[PDB]
Amino acid sequence: DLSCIDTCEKNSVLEVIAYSSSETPNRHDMLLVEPLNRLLQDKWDRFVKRIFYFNFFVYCLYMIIFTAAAYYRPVPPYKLKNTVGDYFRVTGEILSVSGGVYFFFRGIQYFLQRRPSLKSLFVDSYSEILFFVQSLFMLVSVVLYFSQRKEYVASMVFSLAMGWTNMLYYTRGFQQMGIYAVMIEKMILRDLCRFMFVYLVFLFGFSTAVVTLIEDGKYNSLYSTCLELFKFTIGMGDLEFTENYDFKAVFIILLLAYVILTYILLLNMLIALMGETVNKIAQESKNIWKLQRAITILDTEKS
Amino acid sequence: LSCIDTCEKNSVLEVIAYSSSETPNRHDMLLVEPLNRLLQDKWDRFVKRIFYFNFFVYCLYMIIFTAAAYYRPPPYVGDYFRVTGEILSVSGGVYFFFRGIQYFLQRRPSLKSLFVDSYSEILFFVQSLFMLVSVVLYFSQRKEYVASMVFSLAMGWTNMLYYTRGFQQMGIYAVMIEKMILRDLCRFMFVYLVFLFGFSTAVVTLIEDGKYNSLYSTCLELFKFTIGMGDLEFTENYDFKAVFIILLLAYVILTYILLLNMLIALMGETVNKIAQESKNIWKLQRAITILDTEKS
Amino acid sequence: LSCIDTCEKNSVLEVIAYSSSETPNRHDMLLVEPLNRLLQDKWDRFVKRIFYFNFFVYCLYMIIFTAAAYYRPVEGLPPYKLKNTVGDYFRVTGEILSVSGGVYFFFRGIQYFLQRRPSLKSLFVDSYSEILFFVQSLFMLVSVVLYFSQRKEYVASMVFSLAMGWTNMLYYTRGFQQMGIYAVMIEKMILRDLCRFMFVYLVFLFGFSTAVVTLIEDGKYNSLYSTCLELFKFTIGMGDLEFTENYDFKAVFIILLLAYVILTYILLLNMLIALMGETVNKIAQESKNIWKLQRAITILDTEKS
Amino acid sequence: LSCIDTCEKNSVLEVIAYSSSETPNRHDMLLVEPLNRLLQDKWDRFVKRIFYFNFFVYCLYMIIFTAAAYYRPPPYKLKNTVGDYFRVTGEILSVSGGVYFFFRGIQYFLQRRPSLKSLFVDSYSEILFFVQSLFMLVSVVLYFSQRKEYVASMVFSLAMGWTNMLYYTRGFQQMGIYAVMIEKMILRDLCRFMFVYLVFLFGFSTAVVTLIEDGKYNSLYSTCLELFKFTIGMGDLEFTENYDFKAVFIILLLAYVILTYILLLNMLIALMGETVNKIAQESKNIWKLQRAITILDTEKS
Numbered sequence A: 001d002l003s004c005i006d007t008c009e010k011n012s013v014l015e016v017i018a019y020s021s022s023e024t025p026n027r028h029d030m031l032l033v034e035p036l037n038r039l040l041q042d043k044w045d046r047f048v049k050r051i052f053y054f055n056f057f058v059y060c061l062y063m064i065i066f067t068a069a070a071y072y073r074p075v076p077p078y079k080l081k082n083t084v085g086d087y088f089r090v091t092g093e094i095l096s097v098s099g100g101v102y103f104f105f106r107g108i109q110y111f112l113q114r115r116p117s118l119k120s121l122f123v124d125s126y127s128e129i130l131f132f133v134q135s136l137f138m139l140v141s142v143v144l145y146f147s148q149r150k151e152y153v154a155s156m157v158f159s160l161a162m163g164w165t166n167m168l169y170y171t172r173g174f175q176q177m178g179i180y181a182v183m184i185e186k187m188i189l190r191d192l193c194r195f196m197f198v199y200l201v202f203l204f205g206f207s208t209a210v211v212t213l214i215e216d217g218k219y220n221s222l223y224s225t226c227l228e229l230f231k232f233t234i235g236m237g238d239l240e241f242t243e244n245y246d247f248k249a250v251f252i253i254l255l256l257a258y259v260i261l262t263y264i265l266l267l268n269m270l271i272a273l274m275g276e277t278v279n280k281i282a283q284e285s286k287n288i289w290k291l292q293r294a295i296t297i298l299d300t301e302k303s
Numbered sequence B: 001l002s003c004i005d006t007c008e009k010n011s012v013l014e015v016i017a018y019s020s021s022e023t024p025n026r027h028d029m030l031l032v033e034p035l036n037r038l039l040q041d042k043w044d045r046f047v048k049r050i051f052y053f054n055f056f057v058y059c060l061y062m063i064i065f066t067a068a069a070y071y072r073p074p075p076y077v078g079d080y081f082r083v084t085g086e087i088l089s090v091s092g093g094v095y096f097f098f099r100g101i102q103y104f105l106q107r108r109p110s111l112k113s114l115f116v117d118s119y120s121e122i123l124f125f126v127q128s129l130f131m132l133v134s135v136v137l138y139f140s141q142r143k144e145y146v147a148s149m150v151f152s153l154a155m156g157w158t159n160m161l162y163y164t165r166g167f168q169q170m171g172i173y174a175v176m177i178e179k180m181i182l183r184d185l186c187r188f189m190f191v192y193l194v195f196l197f198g199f200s201t202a203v204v205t206l207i208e209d210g211k212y213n214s215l216y217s218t219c220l221e222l223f224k225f226t227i228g229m230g231d232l233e234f235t236e237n238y239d240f241k242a243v244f245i246i247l248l249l250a251y252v253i254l255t256y257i258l259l260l261n262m263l264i265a266l267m268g269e270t271v272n273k274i275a276q277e278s279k280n281i282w283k284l285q286r287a288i289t290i291l292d293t294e295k296s
Numbered sequence C: 001l002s003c004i005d006t007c008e009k010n011s012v013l014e015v016i017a018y019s020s021s022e023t024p025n026r027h028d029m030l031l032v033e034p035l036n037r038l039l040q041d042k043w044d045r046f047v048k049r050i051f052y053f054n055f056f057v058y059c060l061y062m063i064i065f066t067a068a069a070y071y072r073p074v075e076g077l078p079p080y081k082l083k084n085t086v087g088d089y090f091r092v093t094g095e096i097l098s099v100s101g102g103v104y105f106f107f108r109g110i111q112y113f114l115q116r117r118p119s120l121k122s123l124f125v126d127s128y129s130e131i132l133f134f135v136q137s138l139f140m141l142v143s144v145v146l147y148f149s150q151r152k153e154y155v156a157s158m159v160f161s162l163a164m165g166w167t168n169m170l171y172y173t174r175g176f177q178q179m180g181i182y183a184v185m186i187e188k189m190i191l192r193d194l195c196r197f198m199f200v201y202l203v204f205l206f207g208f209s210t211a212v213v214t215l216i217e218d219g220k221y222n223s224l225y226s227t228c229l230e231l232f233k234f235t236i237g238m239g240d241l242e243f244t245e246n247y248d249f250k251a252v253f254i255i256l257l258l259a260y261v262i263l264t265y266i267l268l269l270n271m272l273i274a275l276m277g278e279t280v281n282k283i284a285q286e287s288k289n290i291w292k293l294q295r296a297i298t299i300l301d302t303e304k305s
Numbered sequence D: 001l002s003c004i005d006t007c008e009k010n011s012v013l014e015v016i017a018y019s020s021s022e023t024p025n026r027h028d029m030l031l032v033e034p035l036n037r038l039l040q041d042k043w044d045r046f047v048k049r050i051f052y053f054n055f056f057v058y059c060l061y062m063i064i065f066t067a068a069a070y071y072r073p074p075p076y077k078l079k080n081t082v083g084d085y086f087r088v089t090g091e092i093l094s095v096s097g098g099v100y101f102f103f104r105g106i107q108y109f110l111q112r113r114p115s116l117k118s119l120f121v122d123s124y125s126e127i128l129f130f131v132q133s134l135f136m137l138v139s140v141v142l143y144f145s146q147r148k149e150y151v152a153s154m155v156f157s158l159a160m161g162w163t164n165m166l167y168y169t170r171g172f173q174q175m176g177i178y179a180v181m182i183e184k185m186i187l188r189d190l191c192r193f194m195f196v197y198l199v200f201l202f203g204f205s206t207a208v209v210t211l212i213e214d215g216k217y218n219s220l221y222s223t224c225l226e227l228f229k230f231t232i233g234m235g236d237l238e239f240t241e242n243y244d245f246k247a248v249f250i251i252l253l254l255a256y257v258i259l260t261y262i263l264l265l266n267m268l269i270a271l272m273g274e275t276v277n278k279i280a281q282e283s284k285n286i287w288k289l290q291r292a293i294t295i296l297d298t299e300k301s
């Protein structure tokens, strides 16, 4: 029976389960129940699949237009000339700004309605806050643009990179790619910080040590030697990037100590983030993705 | 055990081997001991020898093809040997093409599960088509025949692994390669292309001008980070060096998280079910080749 | 809870925490109900605040020390006759602060050595943090001595101490469950799964580098340390394979280098596959218990302090 | 412990130790109490000291060999300086040790007579030592023949010996089991995991070489070397510019990189999934078995 499960007009079980924050203990598998799973599957298949594909197509086309507008930028503001190229450029950047403001307004109204928990804003509403950040970046870009500064290009490239990386949102509706995106989100929020809480301190400590040792030269600045030490993580280290110093035994010892420590540090990261292999990762990701698809279904229904 | 291999109507082996991707339990159907013992007996009786001879002939053909290609001087003891090598190589190509056509006539796949099954058949057909386009171009007074021939040569050298079936370890390992490509190449390739394109577009937009201003060059430069050959300073013809550095760093971190979750995903999902799943898939492949060679 | 925390002679916590590693199952004891509840109450009550303050003050110390060391005047032959400037005054104040901190840690280490009175061998299997802090403080003292002995090796001692202290910063990782367990795993892999393959890697590198330098005739590359570095570079993804052609039998050189490459990369493969077979299903609670014991020891030390 | 150690006719230890690996469960069979508890007792009583002395002597031998080789000035002449006398003495000791190893290898093979199929599945360490001795003897032979290939022979023997130190790595639990893991992998996975990689590398090298018209990379050797350098994280992707349209070259290199990375990933996942479970038990059993072989050999010697 479907009575007050969706259309109570006050509170529906599906709505409450969907919009429940991290406070709700057993949410992720709360949809495992058969009455909620079949209903959501039927609704999706019936119309939300088509609506979602249409929205994804429109968004991708928007991103292509924005990319084309940004790539061929003039080398502000710049007065449009009489040419097909100029007309297309102007209309493309107008459309990009029009998308930026629309995203801004959607994010504002979502924030006003939900009033997030002020602690779950990152673990929950990750995608929405990312979209809002993109909108803010582009809005500041245009503000700088019309303020006669050259930092609009910086704020535009930031927004464009954000937007391109935000295409993972639309993997939803696909089983495996959606699960893959869920695993990226979860692993970011879990270890991205934890793993680098010990890697950044190692890098900074050894960078300060080395730069103190280097008496004079090009690399006598903390930033340059920080980059040089970092380059080891890219598998591009030098081991002799400088020669202006004394006691080269100390320098070599420090460099090798850094190498060994960071390699066991990448050994610890790669292994300790094993997650819940087999034991409880073959169902947990599937449940999280199903929950997120339910969120999408409800939002597209109501919108 | 009648109506098993020679019935003129149907048979259990001819049905299981030719089963389409909609059957639930095809590779664990041969698990039954009588079928497994029958197939092993037939193999040891004649298909082992026939398969080994076929493998030797194929390796010979590839040797003659590679030698003829490498010593390439169109159209145009040394020149006699090159010509005979080319003629033999054309014989092999036409032979593989005609077998591919015969198989597709006799199969009529489902048009949707084509790639999952007959992966070797479609690859051989593609190689055959590449090399036939090569010869058409070569006799057409052009030089793209070089490109189409080298593509065919690489494809054939990579197909040489097809014969690894018939050996437990090598067959299982090739089966793992083939399954991972088919079902997971996209899992990592799809997520990685969007990120790379986005960050390459951002960086090139930042770049004021220079050699790397071309989208292709900057995209390749960003890629070079994935093979442990990044530069982090490839260009300096720009401004806002902080934005450049932060974009590159974000890209590097994101690639690390993308390749980490690729490892975690494939490992933690299918570490345990290889010993049985892969073994039974290899058994199915060996059954298919046994039946096909017997019927041929 | 009679005789559980403070009898002025001995209790259960005092002995469980300070029991030497020789004890079979020292770790499981703290999982006993009242013990864990009491430690969690003491922590939340006041040790959270005290430990947070200590972490902040140590971080500030290292900030002041790094700033003073980085701006070291490079003129040669210390000691320096200070020049009247605000920067020079701040630099000398930072030097004083850093030396005072080193001396304080030196007096903490010597006080702790008699306080715990290890058996001179149990000291090796536990208290790594205390030995590390004491050695950092020792480097500081040697650095100042060399500074006032008209020798320039104070820069080497200072950089060693600075790097070591920055690494030791991870000690204050206690009091954060995830971060604490993460650090315990790092030290339990550095100390059990690293040397195992470090011995083998050093043996292989030494053997192959010796062979290669034997083959080489003359040049920059005929030494031993140069070739050892240039064979080690293969491990950090920076291999050359053409770094010298001052030899004979290029086939021998190439085959030796390829053998080395294939051997060291299987060595890293086996590294990963062994360290995964271990420390994954072998150590999750065997690390949580270690973290709990570390935090209990810290709580007891702070309470006694 | 009657009829276990030495009867001159047949003993349980002697039978279990030297018997071929074709038998099913050599590993689990010493697990039983009396054999394992008497083996450990005799080991800790005297064989530990015997083995440590042997290990020290071998280390000294290898140091002497390295010192003699590194300072190589044929045959050569000796001048009036203690350095020359040291060098010749080191050479004499090294060659004497090589001859001893060669004799030991022949003695073992004659006394045990392997099966021509179990010459690698087991007796891994002793055949390596024998081939090292063979390299040393070939080195001296070439040396005295007014040749120059003695440098190659001697460097091969020297590298082989430094690696073979891993045999003495046995006798300690953790290091011994780690060496067992290495040896097992090299034995029963390297061929299968290397044939496929070699096929891919050779195919792509031939393709690129065919596409490349002329230059210093025209030879197959150089192209193969570059395609391999892609595997040590040192690929270039721009190593040539003199060829046909750049597109085909780019699609060849990118396909090569993608395929090799897929190959390594499957390599890892396969030999990891097939092994994770039993390493905790099988590796320990193999280490104990080989220590038992060592104890029996040194007791008989």
Ligand SMILES: CCCCCCCCCCCCCC(=O)OC[C@@H](O)COP(=O)(O)O
Binding pocket: A126, A127, A128, A130, A158, A161, A162, A165, A166, A167, A168, A169, A170, A181, A185, A188, B246, B250, B254
């Ligand atoms: C640390 C500051 C750098 C930020 C610079 C902006 C450009 C970098 C790209 C943004 C970094 C975040 C990348 C990311 O991982 O999130 C994007 C999506 O995959 C996450 O999935 P989704 O959007 O929530 O659906």
Ligand SMILES: CCCCCCCCCCCCCC(=O)OC[C@@H](O)COP(=O)(O)O
Binding pocket: B119, B120, B121, B123, B151, B154, B155, B158, B159, B160, B161, B162, B163, B174, B177, B178, D251, D252, D255, D256, D259
């Ligand atoms: C990027 C597309 C152009 C690629 C041109 C050719 C170079 C790549 C080689 C072709 C890809 C094939 C990869 C592969 O792994 O299949 C080859 C065999 O092992 C598969 O075994 P089988 O024939 O199916 O039995």
Ligand SMILES: CCCCCCCCCCCCCC(=O)OC[C@@H](O)COP(=O)(O)O
Binding pocket: C255, C256, C259, C260, D124, D125, D126, D128, D156, D159, D160, D163, D164, D165, D166, D167, D179, D182, D183, D186
């Ligand atoms: C002619 C030689 C060409 C190749 C260059 C020399 C490289 C040879 C490296 C040694 C080969 C064996 C590989 C190995 O694993 O090393 C350790 C050995 O102890 C085997 O272990 P163990 O003694 O059997 O226990």
Ligand code: NA
Binding pocket: A234, A235, B227, B228, C236, C237, D232, D233
């Ligand atoms: Na690398």
Ligand code: NA
Binding pocket: A234, A235, A236, B227, B228, B229, C236, C237, C238, D232, D233, D234
């Ligand atoms: Na590299």
